[PDB]
């Protein structure tokens, strides 16, 4: 947490930092996107 690093999450790639999400999300949700076709939220499959 709180470091700019490379991401590999389930085949998807990105670069950024990890902060705690306070928004209420679906329990069946794998990921979510932004205003473009770009990411914000990922799910860690081992520990949720």
């Amino acid at each position: 947490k709180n470091k700019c690093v490379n991401f590999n999450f389930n085949g998807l790639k990105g670069t950024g930092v990890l902060t705690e999400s306070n928004k209420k999300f679906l329990p069946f949700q794998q990921f979510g996107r932004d205003i473009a076709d770009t990411t914000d939220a990922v799910r860690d499959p081992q520990t949720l």
Binding site: K23, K24, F25, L26, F28, F31, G32
Partner: protein, 251 residues
């Protein structure tokens, strides 16, 4: 089995209208405070849905699948136990059956023998099916507890299901909220996705009976079956990620 009872008769297709309802999440993608435009099979705004009722008679026509399935039901004691999903409606092909005993929902694809209007008491099979063979597919859902006994007062159960088949994938969109002409706007959530991959051209319904062959007396319930149509909606998302408003593109 082959003997038609009192509740099997020819009745006319009375209809009703719907305005707000029929809006589901097209995907699991979270979008916040934006208007998303997507194209999927949707229930159209200002449409005609076919109204069904049961009081000495029961409505079970054989309805084709290919215009889509929209289900909504306003009930007390949860009369509808599931559906029959098939093509030629015999043992020559595969058929899907949903059995809800209000413990664990049994979902199987197997070769069954079908009647015109199958009955349920506990459960009775057959009339639903007499015998079965040649299936490797079994599915076990999550256990729960519901009340099948009768209740009083206001109508406490609203079950809204959207059933569709896209590229051999069967999806169940489930929403339950407390509530002949309903109102209110809601957003449906997905539940069970099974990649079965069968051709379903027609569908039927199921009925649970009670007794204080023909001595089993049906209860009082109402539901309606809608159709879908490739359209475009605009979905209004809040900060919590729910749909508070839906605007059709062309109506």
């Amino acid at each position: 089995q082959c003997v038609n009872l009192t509740t099997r008769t020819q009745l006319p297709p009375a209809y009703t209208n719907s305005f707000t309802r029929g809006v589901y999440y097209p995907d699991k993608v979270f979008r916040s405070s934006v208007l998303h435009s997507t194209q999927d099979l949707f229930l159209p705004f200002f449409s005609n849905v076919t109204w069904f009722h049961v009081i000495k008679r029961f409505d079970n026509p054989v309805l084709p699948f290919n215009d889509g399935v929209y289900f909504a039901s306003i009930e007390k004691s949860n009369i509808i136990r599931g559906w029959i999903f098939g093509t030629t409606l015999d043992s020559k092909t595969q058929s899907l059956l949903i059995v809800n005993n209000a413990t664990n929902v049994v979902i199987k694809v197997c070769e069954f023998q079908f009647c015109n209007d199958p009955f349920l008491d506990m459960e009775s099979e057959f009339r639903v099916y007499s015998s079965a063979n040649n299936c490797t597919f079994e599915y076990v859902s999550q256990p729960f507890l519901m009340d099948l006994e009768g209740k009083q007062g206001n109508f406490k159960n609203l079950r809204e299901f959207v059933f569709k088949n896209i590229d051999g994938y069967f999806k169940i969109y489930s929403k339950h909220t407390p509530i002949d002409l309903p109102q209110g706007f809601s957003a449906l959530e997905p539940l069970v996705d099974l990649p079965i991959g069968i051709n379903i051209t027609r569908f039927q319904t199921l009925l649970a009976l009670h007794r204080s062959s023909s001595g089993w007396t049906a209860g009082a319930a109402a539901y309606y079956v809608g159709y879908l149509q490739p359209r475009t909606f605009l979905l209004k998302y809040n900060e919590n990620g729910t749909i508070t408003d839906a605007v059709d593109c062309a109506l």
